Amino acid sequence: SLALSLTADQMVSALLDAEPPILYSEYDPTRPFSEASMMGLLTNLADRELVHMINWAKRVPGFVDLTLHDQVHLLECAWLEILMIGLVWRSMEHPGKLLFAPNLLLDRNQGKCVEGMVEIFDMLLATSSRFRMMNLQGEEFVCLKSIILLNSGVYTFLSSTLKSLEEKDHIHRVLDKITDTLIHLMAKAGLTLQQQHQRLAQLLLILSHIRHMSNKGMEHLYSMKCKNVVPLSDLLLEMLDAHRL
Amino acid sequence: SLALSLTADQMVSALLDAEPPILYSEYDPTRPFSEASMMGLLTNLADRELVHMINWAKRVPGFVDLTLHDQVHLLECAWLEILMIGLVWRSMEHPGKLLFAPNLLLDRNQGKCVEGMVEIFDMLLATSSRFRMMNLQGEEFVCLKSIILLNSGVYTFEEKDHIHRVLDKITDTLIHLMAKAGLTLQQQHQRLAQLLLILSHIRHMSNKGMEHLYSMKCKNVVPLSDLLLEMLDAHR
Amino acid sequence: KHKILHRLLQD
Amino acid sequence: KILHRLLQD
Numbered sequence: 456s457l458a459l460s461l462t463a464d465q466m467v468s469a470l471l472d473a474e475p476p477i478l479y480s481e482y483d484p485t486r487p488f489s490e491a492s493m494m495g496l497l498t499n500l501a502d503r504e505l506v507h508m509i510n511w512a513k514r515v516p517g518f519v520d521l522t523l524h525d526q527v528h529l530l531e532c533a534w535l536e537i538l539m540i541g542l543v544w545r546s547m548e549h550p551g552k553l554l555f556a557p558n559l560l561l562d563r564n565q566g567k568c569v570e571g572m573v574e575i576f577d578m579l580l581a582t583s584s585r586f587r588m589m590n591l592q593g594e595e596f597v598c599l600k601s602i603i604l605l606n607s608g609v610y611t612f613l614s615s616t617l618k619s620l621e622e623k624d625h626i627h628r629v630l631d632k633i634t635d636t637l638i639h640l641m642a643k644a645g646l647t648l649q650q651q652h653q654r655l656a657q658l659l660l661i662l663s664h665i666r667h668m669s670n671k672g673m674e675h676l677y678s679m680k681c682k683n684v685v686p687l688s689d690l691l692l693e694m695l696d697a698h699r700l
Numbered sequence: 701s702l703a704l705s706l707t708a709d710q711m712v713s714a715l716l717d718a719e720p721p722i723l724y725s726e727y728d729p730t731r732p733f734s735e736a737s738m739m740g741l742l743t744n745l746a747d748r749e750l751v752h753m754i755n756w757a758k759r760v761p762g763f764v765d766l767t768l769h770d771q772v773h774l775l776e777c778a779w780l781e782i783l784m785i786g787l788v789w790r791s792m793e794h795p796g797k798l799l800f801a802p803n804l805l806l807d808r809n810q811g812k813c814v815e816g817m818v819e820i821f822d823m824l825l826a827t828s829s830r831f832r833m834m835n836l837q838g839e840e841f842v843c844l845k846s847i848i849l850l851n852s853g854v855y856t857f858e859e860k861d862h863i864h865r866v867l868d869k870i871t872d873t874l875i876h877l878m879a880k881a882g883l884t885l886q887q888q889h890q891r892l893a894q895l896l897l898i899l900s901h902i903r904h905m906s907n908k909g910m911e912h913l914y915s916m917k918c919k920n921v922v923p924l925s926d927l928l929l930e931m932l933d934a935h936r
Numbered sequence: 937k938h939k940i941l942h943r944l945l946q947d
Numbered sequence: 948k949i950l951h952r953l954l955q956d
């Protein structure tokens with residue numbers, strides 16, 4: 456696995472080059488929001504972002520070493536965590552707002568258009584604030600987003616001796632590499648040894664909050680689906696259904 | 701604040717001291733399970749453990765510096781994570797079984813006694829197996845449990861600053877334990893990350909567990925205590 | 937107004 | 948499965 460042989464600098468550079476584009480929403484700015492129309496915008500966007508995510512995932516070192524079955528389980532597990540951490544990143548420089556897209560910048564009050572949404576908005580906003588407080592750097596962001604991809608689904612594997620186990624090993628080797636890379640960035644940034652471990656922890660603890668947000672957004676998305684608020688694409692339907700079985 | 705001045709050794713000592721007891725279940729092992737009895741056993745147990753958890757939290761350095769309201773918020777957010785990491789930890793040396801209590805050790809398949817339960821069991825066991833392969837130490841475990849208490853509800857809030865200061869001290873404590881254990885700096889940072897990433901899976905399980913518990917309540921498959929209903933209500 | 941957790945904490 | 952096909956590209 457040539458990926459295991461990468462330096463920290465090579466890991467960072469590869470992750471930066473893999474970054475997906477910032478997409479635009481199909482927001483028609485001279486039409487009144489409804490619950491249905493706002494949900495449509497978010498799910499239309501997500502659907503287009505998913506195709507770009509898949510090509511990004513293929514570009515994360517080690518991901519293409521895994522089987523097709525395992526790549527699927529990993530993306531199925533983490534897709535919404537990844538979209539949300541991207542959103543929180545994009546929003547870093549806009550206090551009080553979520554930059555879903557350059558033409559779709561929403562504050563919490565706009566979240567109230569959709570029932571149950573404001574609660575999720577509020578968690579995303581607080582995560583954005585935390586990112587700002589910590590002064591999260593893009594090099595750290597891309598590492599974290601890659602940790603989510605590799606980690607979130609890693610224990611929902613089963614165990615078929617060597618087969619499942621070595622896919623698990625590999626993933627952990629790669630995760631260990633991203634840790635080394637994170638530490639490297641903080642050292643190059645001049646943080647002390649103590650600050651390095653402290654910051655490493657602060658950043659990883661955020662992931663527990665992103666998981667929480669993904670769990671609640673998946674519940675919320677399921678609810679919108681079950682209430683015929685919005686038509687989901689087959690892709691999004693499949694991604695959502697992976698969380699009900 | 702007095703928790704900010706603890707040494708690493710003294711953080712561990714304090715956390716080790718604050719540990720709640722291992723409770724027994726009421727289960728009469730002369731009779732087999734039903735869906736209603738198993739779930740009754742689980743909730744009766746959790747309800748008794750919750751009383752001890754509140755005592756334990758008050759003994760977590762820095763927790764008592766927080767306002768009563770903040771203390772409540774943290775416990776409401778984290779209670780099921782805390783119960784589950786506990787369960788994962790005592791099941792650690794029983795591959796394939798979940799030691800809910802010394803007299804209630806349930807192998808994977810008994811999760812099928814309750815609809816929807818086996819999926820949660822499978823997650824719990826996978827986590828136990830992870831702990832095992834990492835050889836999680838008790839001193840590390842108590843650090844992790846306290847991190848959950850302090851971290852899980854913090855972003856849903858000077859109060860925030862203190863929690864982050866205490867969190868830093870516990871990070872300092874975990875790294876101390878690993879340094880003490882002979883690990884290189886590189887191994888120390890790799891193990892710190894590995895342990896903290898498990899907290900993401902523990903959150904996942906809590907969230908899943910919460911919806912299952914909610915379903916079992918609506919479908920009325922078992923009566924829940926007032927305290928447990930209240931801890932449930934906090935999430936919805 | 938009278939959550940059980942509240943009163944358990946203040947003991 | 949759509950996800951499966953997309954990964955194959």
Ligand SMILES: CCc1c2cc(O)ccc2nn1-c1ccc(O)cc1
Nearest residue numbers: 497498500501538539542672675676
């Ligand atoms: C996956 C689309 C989506 C949501 C669905 C919900 O039910 C609630 C909140 C949601 N946010 N998003 C979302 C997040 C980040 C994006 O880049 C696109 C959509």
Ligand SMILES: CCc1c2cc(O)ccc2nn1-c1ccc(O)cc1
Nearest residue numbers: 742743745746783784787909912913
């Ligand atoms: C809150 C009791 C409980 C569960 C309820 C569910 O619906 C599903 C799984 C559950 N696990 N537990 C649980 C976890 C740890 C304990 O120490 C005791 C009960």
